[PDB]
Amino acid sequence: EVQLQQSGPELVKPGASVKMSCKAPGYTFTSYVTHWVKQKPGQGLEWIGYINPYNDSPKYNEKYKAKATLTSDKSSSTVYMELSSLTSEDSAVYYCARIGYFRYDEGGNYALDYWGQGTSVTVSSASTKGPSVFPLAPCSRSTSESTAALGCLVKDYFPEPVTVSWNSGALTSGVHTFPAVLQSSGLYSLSSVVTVPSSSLGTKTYTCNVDHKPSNTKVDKRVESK
Amino acid sequence: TVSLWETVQKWREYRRQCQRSLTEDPPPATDLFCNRTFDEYACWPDGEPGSFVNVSCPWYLPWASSVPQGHVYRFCTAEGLWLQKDNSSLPWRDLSECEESSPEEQLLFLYIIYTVGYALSFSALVIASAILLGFRHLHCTRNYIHLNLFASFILRALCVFFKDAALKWMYSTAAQQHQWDGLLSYQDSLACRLVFLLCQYCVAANYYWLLVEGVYLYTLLAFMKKYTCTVCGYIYNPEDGDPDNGVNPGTDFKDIPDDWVCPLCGVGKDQFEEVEEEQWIFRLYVAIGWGVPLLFVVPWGIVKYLYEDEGCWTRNSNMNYWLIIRLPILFACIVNFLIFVRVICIVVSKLKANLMCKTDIAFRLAKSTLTLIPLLCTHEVIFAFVMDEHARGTLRFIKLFTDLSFTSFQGLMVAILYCFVNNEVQLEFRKSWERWR
Amino acid sequence: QIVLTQSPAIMSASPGEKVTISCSASSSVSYMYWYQQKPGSSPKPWIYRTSKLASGVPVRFSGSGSGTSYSLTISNMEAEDAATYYCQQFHTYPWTFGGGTKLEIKRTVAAPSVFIFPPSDEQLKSGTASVVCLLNNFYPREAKVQWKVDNALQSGNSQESVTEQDSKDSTYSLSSTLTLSKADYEKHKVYACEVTHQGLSSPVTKSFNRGEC
Ligand SMILES: CC1(C)CC([C@@H](Nc2ccc(-n3cnc(C(F)(F)F)c3)nc2)c2ccc(C(=O)NCCC(=O)O)cc2)C1
Ligand SMILES: *[C@@H]1O[C@H](CO)[C@@H](O)[C@H](O)[C@H]1NC(C)=O
Ligand SMILES: [Zn+2]
Prior knowledge:
CATH topology of the largest domain in chain A: Immunoglobulin-like
Entry title: Crystal structure of full length human GLP1 receptor in complex with Fab fragment (Fab7F38)
Number of strands of chain A: 19
Bound molecules: the ligand CC1(C)CC([C@@H](Nc2ccc(-n3cnc(C(F)(F)F)c3)nc2)c2ccc(C(=O)NCCC(=O)O)cc2)C1, 2-acetamido-2-deoxy-beta-D-glucopyranose, zinc ion
PDB class: membrane protein
Assembly: trimeric
CATH superfamily of the largest domain in chain A: Immunoglobulins
Distance between the termini of chain A: 45 Å
Oligomer: heterotrimer
Chain A: Fab7F38_heavy chain
Order of helices and strands of chain B: HEEHHHHHHHHHH
Keywords: Full length Human GLP1 receptor, Fab7F38, TMD, NAM PF06372222, membrane protein, LCP
Largest sheet of chain A: 7 strands, mixed
């Protein structure tokens, strides 16, 4: 349902600045002011501020003054949010939304209808690392349990995310891709297992496509029972 | 018929109703809303965010009878702003349902006589100032002061020529009734800023060069008195005279025959440089003509920028800071009339005592100077203080706006009376016509 | 400035049960706004002007409120309604949101199908060794994984990760990754994982012997 074409994900060193784009196909004559919203896991949802594109004058949340810098492009009609002197507290998804009006005749019937995909920001001193993928197969013993599990352990990568597909998306059921866990080391790791029939462990091949765009890691690990 | 004056008197009451309500009315207690403001056209309340604010059409309008109930709109956004459309301009308003007259027939007519009255004056003044500067036979102490009084009016006439250009500039964007009104606003914020300032200085310069004109006329009459020359600069000592050519020692220039020429260069007696003191005293005349106007126009402009620079510094409702320009102009007017009065006192005594003739330059100029001083400062003395007493100099300033659309000619009046009427330029006219045939 | 507090944190309801999510504001506001955000996409207008529904929202949902106290309610509850719901205020600046209330769907108690995987011998080159213990499709979420390397109760070396409630069968899946050294690993033989769950009569222990497979 995303209408606002926002910018890509960002990995920024603490103390730096990040400036993200929010290209709109075209501002509605009724709604042209873009609002920016911060979604930090556990912090909830936070309205950062807005930018009036017709006069380039922005409104800010007092909390995010001298933190965010809202500007607009005249030609391309695109909003921009810069985040100066970044810290861990600023690692979040950043949305740009516009109000969609339900009933202009009656006052107050409106909502942030036009949403952006969300520009995620990872404020870490850790350099982008690649995931080493390992199989998750058993000790070749089942004694006919009629159900068998196997998988990938995508280890030690930065920043999130890792895209785990199975059998190049042909395998869609019994699949479980667990949410990444930042290891004490500082890197993320996640398992992706799949329950298959125990009879297939010697007949059907289970390749496991892992993708990590940051480090541009692309791997196909075929998991076998030793 | 609908009147062009009553329609403004009704407008003045529409702003009274507006100002009264947008100050008497309670705040919505919604915190986030869009402010109640006067468009200078319609009166708008506070808008509920995300609602079409529909208002009844202004009753001061002539065609207000033909479009009853009224449907002039504006939209309050969820953000708490009035819908923009174009931010470099005013916020979106729909005056579509309220459009088409006799009062605008008189308005266009008032503007037509205003601009042609200014085009007429400027042309007359520029050609007049070209007459005194082109002809060498006129490079004298007296005419120099006129050229400066010409200049202040000439700049004032090209000042209205710049404001009208901004008026025609913004209106040529496209063709729309709402835009016509909008083009006025976009120019009421930017172009209006610097021009109206120089205009206020020009006006201040008119009245103060009128002062030195009257002062020079007083000095030209209050003048043992000696003379000089403008061509080579020979100083005619009257106490020494010039008997080497036929004038005994102890004779004033006024008693030297017209059949006389300067012994050094050879130019006519009509090119005498007045009292030898006229030369340096002109520096003071410039210091009074341009210096003093700066001494109160920039103080005013400064505070009209540090304190209230909203709406081209035209809105003077909060405080009467406009006295920084009114009182000095009023001061000039009181002494200009005091000069006027004293000049008549002297001329009548001098003429009756046979000590002066009507044929003189001092009387010929008196006729002119005593004509500008009364008309140009008359309004600025009676109203100045009497009306200031109460809030009825309010409705008098609306009349002054209409006056200003008739005071466009007052530039030509200076041009004629000081150049076209001059007996000297008339001799130059006859010299130029004879040089062809 | 103004603060929107919405209770509970996570809500679990069986289908066809009354769900009612609150949202009490700091200062009294005019209208309340709700957004349904489904993990994996941006938020979506769900309820506007306190009680008005957004287009496509089913009639089970009803917004209700006045002053500070507002709520979102569901009658004929359905699994499609499992998501985080954020209340929002448009009344004053800054515009406050709610903490969100993750809604989950109660279901029959299911026991986990447990699986233990030794570390790859590819990993037994990386200087580490991570042993995984999978628990598949149990309900409820609360499950206990207990690692026992040579009958030694491991502690604070593993990290468990639970998926979201399944779209199709409202179950969960949990993985516990026993991260270990290559040296620590090669020192012990029997590697086991003891799973304790509501659906299990007795804690199931799926084991394996080091290298012996
Ligand atoms: C159209 C008008 C209203 C301005 C016209 C007229 N005004 C005018 C005429 C006469 C007296 N007057 C006589 N006696 C006294 C007294 F009482 F003694 F003071 C005053 N006052 C005023 C005027 C005519 C001639 C000139 C003139 O040539 N300028 C050129 C100056 C020059 O050659 O360098 C100027 C003005 C009528
Ligand atoms: C204001 O006018 C609009 C049409 O532009 C209409 O939809 C709405 O009902 C009007 N509001 C009021 C106050 O009647
Ligand atoms: Zn000479």
